[PDB]
C-alpha cells in the first residue's frame, strides 16, 4: 500500500491481515493501523484526520448512530431558525427603505 507520507515524500508499506473478521488487509503508519483501500494512495501529509481499521465487532452500534443523528438534527434546526431570522430582517429592511 503506497502513499504520500508524513514528511511530504512518497512512501510504501507492506500489507498485514486484520479486521473484525481478521482476514482483511491492513497497513500501518506511525503505529496507526489502516485498511489498504482507505490508505492506498492517500496523502497523509494533508488529512491525518482519517479513520482506522476496526478491531472487533462493535457492541452497541445503534446508540452511537442515534447520538450522531441527534447532533445532525440539532444543527438542522438551528439553521432553519437562522433562515427565518434572515427572512424577517429582509422584510424589515424593505419596509425601512420604503419609509
Amino acid at each position: 500500500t503506497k502513499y504520500t507520507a508524513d514528511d511530504g515524500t512518497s512512501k510504501t508499506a507492506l500489507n498485514k491481515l486484520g479486521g473484525a473478521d481478521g482476514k482483511t488487509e491492513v497497513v500501518s503508519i506511525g503505529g496507526k493501523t489502516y485498511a489498504a483501500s482507505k490508505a492506498e494512495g492517500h496523502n497523509f501529509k494533508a488529512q491525518p484526520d482519517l479513520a482506522e481499521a476496526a478491531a472487533t465487532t462493535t457492541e452497541n452500534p445503534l446508540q452511537k448512530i442515534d447520538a450522531a443523528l441527534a447532533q445532525v438534527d440539532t444543527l438542522r434546526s438551528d439553521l432553519g431558525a437562522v433562515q427565518n431570522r434572515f427572512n424577517s430582517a429582509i422584510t424589515n429592511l424593505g419596509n425601512t427603505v420604503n419609509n
Binding site: 438542522r76 434546526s77 432553519g80 431558525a81 433562515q83 427565518n84 424593505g94 419596509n95 420604503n98
Partner: protein
C-alpha cells in the same frame, strides 16, 4: 404636491407584490412535494420528530 422623481406609490406597491410572490412560492412547493415540512425552515421541531 405632484412629485415626479420619487413616485412613492409604486414603491409601496412593489412590497405588496413581493409578499404575494413568497406566499405563492410556498404554496406551490408544498403542493408539489406532498409534504408540509419540505425545508427545515418550515418546522424545526416537526423536522426532528
Amino acid at each position: 404636491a405632484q412629485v415626479i422623481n420619487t413616485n412613492s406609490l409604486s414603491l409601496l406597491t412593489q412590497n405588496n407584490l413581493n409578499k404575494s410572490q413568497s406566499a405563492l412560492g410556498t404554496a406551490i412547493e408544498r403542493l408539489s412535494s406532498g409534504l408540509r415540512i419540505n425545508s427545515a425552515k418550515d418546522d424545526a421541531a416537526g423536522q426532528a420528530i
